[PDB]
Design a protein around this ligand. Structure first.
Ligand code: EFZ
Lengths: 404, 556
């Protein structure tokens, strides 16, 4: 077909990111995946006249054994935003976040559309070699690539033709496309939903597009409150911490009255000294916590601002997080629990990212509590998504205290 | 020759046009030179004549070559270059000898490489220079290039790209002949016999000949040793080139540096190399010729290093069918060394880690840092992460990782008792210390003065308030905790309101850059039970309120 002319954000230039070192098997795995993408003519070898580079990795399928190529187009996406967002934007359904949602990988569907011959140089990538004993294999895309948010946008046309029949015959089933994935949601019963899915897989199949699984239940995604203890005992130590956390709960969740519980059994007593109880207190613990159960009044999602995900390590496979646009203005807090610390953190990121895509339709930027070099060395060892969120590394302060 | 090989198309940065630098007049002897030289090249095909219908001109010079027998032709391309397109780097890494597979190795060197390769036609017109005529009279001979000019941006890029495409077939034919191409040279090795090897070599030279690429005859230079990139490679082993310690009277900064440099370079295969004492001496903007008297430790360190180098030590080559074991040893303070091997003690490569990583850090953290570093290095060199052998207890490690705020991993590892063992030098209780004073430390200070009173107050009436001079509002909160530890028992409950103070201590630091913080540590290592709590600073809570009063009142 005719290629959709693509252009970069004027003033900006193609990606020039280095290829992070890979382990033997991921190399061998890729030189095989790319050697076949060459037969099929989806990518072509390139010359030194290409000054560009975008990194790539090999991850494992849905826990199977067939490696997948994962190109990190995180940069080129930015250099292309104007294109994939305003020009050919893809609408997000507010209904999706409301009994079941299946995620289907309509990815292979892009390698069928040519890519503007004038844009292919911007998708160059390199397959490194151990110990640098060899130049290093270079390539570029001739067809729409998979990590590139640009792909969905161009393919957003053909896609509609495919789904159309299925949509016209199921006016109540929601379909959302998001960079490589198709999100199908319905209020039906598991059996009726699950069936309707297969039904869709067949429509897809007729356009040369096989499918998988993986079911999310959005209507049961709930907020993670900021808990307040409730022990029968009570030490000066305990009550102090209680007034410590309640303090925090004020720079957010406006209305948290801590006046009564404060100045409580004060003076200069030993931390141990067990203490009584008050009636203003009994009422303040409850009066406040009740405010802590509900969402922050005054906070609303802002389509123009970035979403941020902050994750704290709670200990014992416990991880707590928060999604917000303006510090301490939580659009949502949550949890994640149940081997390696890195193995769990990446797990949580994807869960969170997935939830973010369903609700706001965009991935958040993670402020990750780990050492940069460590993350980079292993994230791709447990990663299974086809997208890669933005991420900065932070040093979690003595705030793990409160669950937020 | 001029390899038939296709040419790499190239062009100038988009919003730009060729160079047009005027040709400054050269002396008569120089003009003769360039004429004897160019005329020569032209007969070779490396350059061709062009007329005044070529608005592109790049300066030309000549300088006496080796001892001045023959002249050389320097074509200051700086202009063409700043306008040429950016290319893909020639190398983004170097083979580490330790990652090379261990019979026959010889090195062929491409004669006139850059010149034995064609240049994209549509671009030739830009590499047009000119030979002046005895004081700018006659016009001059105009010339352009048909092969890769020397000092040009894309000559290394395009030469390599080609030399690679030319080897592809031969390599495919002999997947048993490892071929590494470093610039103008080609390192070729195999597990054949000196006879069957040289046979292949020829076949290669021939294959190369069929592509305009000329190569040595009996001057193969093969004969390992192989002095390459600082190393001395042999077919069976490797090592750093000869390191020789000057051993002189007085040392200048310039001297201490070159030394630190050989030593760092030696530490790749030589275990034990220490440079902490020597580096110290290089602190503070010091003249490059300034002599520096050696301290005790330095004088000694140079000794131990001198010792480690008296006898040659060689590394061994990598074997894919075996694992990699890496053992890390804690040398002195904040100093770590490690060895990587496959066969017990036949080191593949050595190394040392000393990075600081801010102030406030403890051995477990550092060891995790050294493990990370070594891992990265092993993925690049050997394509896989080694199995570690650490001088830390699985207990000390698990106890430290499961409580820390930061996420931490660490590849398969085993213990190995090689003292000094690693350990946490003190813990912080989770639940208060019943029957044990409760110091409420606090601090403050005037900002447009830098004066503050640090102090505390207990549940036993005690209350001290020592004044400070030139302290930040923080030190006065971190100094109040140092007090609470002095005039305190072997078990104490300190209550601070300095997130800043609570942060530093909470992360069991066992060494620091803050002298106070180091003091606050000795204490902690001496107490027998400490508990740290925080409460809203200056918010007015029973306790902090009271100390806050005699602390802030006056001098605030
Ligand atoms: O894999 C090997 N083995 C090897 C063993 C001994 C010597 Cl000296 C040289 C090599 C070799 C190389 C190289 C250049 C970077 C130094 C060769 F490619 F074979 F030349 O790389």
């Amino acid at each position: 077909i005719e290629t959709v002319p693509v252009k970069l954000k004027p003033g900006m230039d193609g990606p020039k990111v280095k290829q992070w070192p890979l382990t033997e098997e991921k190399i061998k795995a890729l030189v095989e995946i790319c050697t076949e993408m060459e037969k099929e003519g989806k990518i072509s070898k390139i010359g030194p006249e290409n000054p560009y580079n975008t990194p790539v990795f090999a991850i494992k399928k849905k826990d199977s054994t067939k490696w997948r190529k994962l190109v990190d187009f995180r940069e080129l996406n930015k250099r292309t935003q104007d294109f994939w967002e305003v020009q050919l934007g893809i609408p997000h359904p507010a209904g999706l976040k409301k009994k079941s949602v299946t995620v289907l990988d309509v990815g292979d569907a892009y390698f069928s559309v040519p890519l503007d011959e004038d844009f292919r140089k911007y998708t160059a990538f390199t397959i490194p070699s151990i110990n640098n004993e060899t130049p290093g294999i270079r390539y570029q895309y001739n067809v729409l690539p998979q990590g590139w948010k640009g792909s969905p946008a161009i393919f957003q046309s053909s896609m509609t033709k495919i789904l159309e029949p299925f949509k016209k015959q199921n006016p109540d089933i929601v379909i959302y496309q998001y960079m490589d994935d198709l999100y199908v949601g319905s209020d039906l019963e598991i059996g009726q939903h699950r069936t309707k899915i297969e039904e869709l897989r067949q429509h897809l199949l007729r356009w040369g597009l096989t499918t998988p699984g993986y079911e999310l239940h959005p209507d049961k995604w709930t907020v993670q409150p900021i808990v307040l203890p409730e022990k029968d005992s009570w030490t000066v130590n305990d009550i102090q911490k209680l007034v410590g956390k309640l303090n925090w709960a004020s720079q957010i969740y406006p209305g948290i009255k801590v006046r009564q519980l404060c100045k409580l059994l004060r003076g200069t007593k030993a931390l141990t000294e067990v203490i009584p109880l008050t009636e203003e207190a009994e009422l303040e613990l409850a009066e406040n916590r009740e405010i802590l159960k509900e969402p922050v009044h005054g906070v609303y999602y802002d389509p123009s601002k970035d979403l941020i995900a902050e994750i704290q390590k709670q200990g014992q496979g416990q991880w707590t997080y928060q999604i917000y646009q303006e510090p301490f203005k939580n659009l949502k807090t949550g949890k994640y629990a149940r081997t390696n610390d890195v193995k769990q953190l990446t797990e949580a990121v994807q869960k969170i990212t997935t939830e973010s895509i369903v609700i706001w339709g965009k991935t958040p930027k993670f402020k990750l509590p780990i050492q940069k070099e460590t993350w980079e060395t292993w994230w791709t060892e447990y990663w299974q998504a086809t997208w890669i969120p933005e991420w900065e590394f932070v040093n979690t302060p003595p705030l793990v205290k409160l669950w937020y | 020759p001029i390899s038939p090989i296709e040419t790499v198309p190239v062009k100038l940065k988009p919003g730009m046009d060729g160079p047009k630098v005027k040709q400054w007049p050269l002396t008569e002897e120089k003009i003769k030179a360039l004429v004897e030289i160019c005329t020569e090249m032209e007969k070779e095909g490396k350059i061709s004549k062009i007329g005044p219908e070529n608005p592109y001109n790049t300066p030309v010079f000549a300088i006496k070559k080796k001892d001045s027998t023959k002249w050389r032709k320097l074509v200051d391309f700086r202009e063409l270059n700043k306008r040429t397109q950016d290319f893909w780097e020639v190398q983004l890494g170097i083979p580490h000898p330790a990652g090379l597979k261990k019979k026959s190795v010889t090195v062929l060197d491409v004669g006139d490489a850059y010149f034995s390769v064609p240049l994209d036609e549509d671009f030739r017109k830009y590499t047009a220079f000119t030979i002046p005529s005895i004081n700018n009279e006659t016009p001059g001979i105009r010339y352009q290039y048909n092969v890769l000019p020397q000092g040009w941006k894309g000559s290394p890029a395009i030469f390599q790209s080609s030399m690679t495409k030319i080897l592809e077939p031969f390599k495919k034919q002999n997947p048993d002949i490892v071929i590494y191409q470093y610039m103008d040279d080609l390192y070729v090795g195999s597990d054949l016999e000196i006879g069957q090897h040289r046979t292949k070599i020829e076949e290669l030279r021939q294959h190369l000949l069929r592509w305009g690429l000329t190569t040595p005859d009996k001057k193969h230079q093969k004969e390992p040793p192989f002095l390459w990139m600082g190393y001395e490679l042999h077919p069976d082993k490797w090592t750093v080139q000869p390191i020789v310690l000057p051993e002189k009277d007085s040392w200048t900064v310039n001297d201490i540096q070159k030394l630190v440099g050989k030593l760092n370079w030696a530490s790749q295969i030589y275990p034990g190399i220490k440079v902490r004492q020597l580096c110290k001496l290089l602190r503070g903007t010091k003249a490059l010729t300034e002599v520096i008297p050696l301290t005790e430790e330095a004088e000694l360190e140079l000794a131990e290093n001198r010792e480690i180098l008296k006898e040659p030590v060689h590394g061994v080559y990598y074997d894919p069918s075996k694992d990699l074991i890496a053992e890390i040893q804690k040398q002195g303070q904040g100093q770590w060394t490690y060895q990587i091997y496959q066969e017990p003690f036949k080191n593949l490569k050595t190394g040392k880690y000393a990075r600081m990583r801010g102030a406030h850090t403890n051995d477990v953290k550092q060891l995790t840092e050294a493990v990370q570093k070594i891992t990265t290095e092993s993925i690049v060199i050997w394509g896989k992460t080694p199995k570690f052998k650490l001088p830390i207890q699985k207990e000390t490690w698990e106890t430290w990782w499961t409580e820390y705020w930061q996420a931490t991993w660490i590849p398969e590892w085993e213990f190995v008792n090689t003292p000094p063992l690693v350990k946490l030098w003190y813990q912080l209780e989770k639940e208060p210390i019943v029957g044990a004073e409760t110091f409420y430390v606090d601090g403050a200070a005037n900002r447009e003065t830098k004066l503050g009173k640090a102090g505390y107050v207990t549940n036993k009436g005690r209350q001290k308030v020592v004044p400070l001079t030139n302290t930040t509002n923080q030190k006065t909160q971190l100094q109040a905790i140092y007090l609470a530890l002095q005039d305190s028992g072997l078990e104490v409950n300190i209550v601070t309101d300095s997130q800043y103070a609570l942060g530093i201590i909470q992360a069991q630091p066992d060494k620091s850059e803050s002298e106070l913080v180091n003091q606050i540590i000795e204490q902690l290592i001496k107490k027998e039970k400490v508990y740290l709590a925080w409460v809203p600073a200056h918010k007015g809570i029973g306790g902090n309120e009271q100390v806050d009063k005699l602390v802030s009142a006056g001098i605030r």
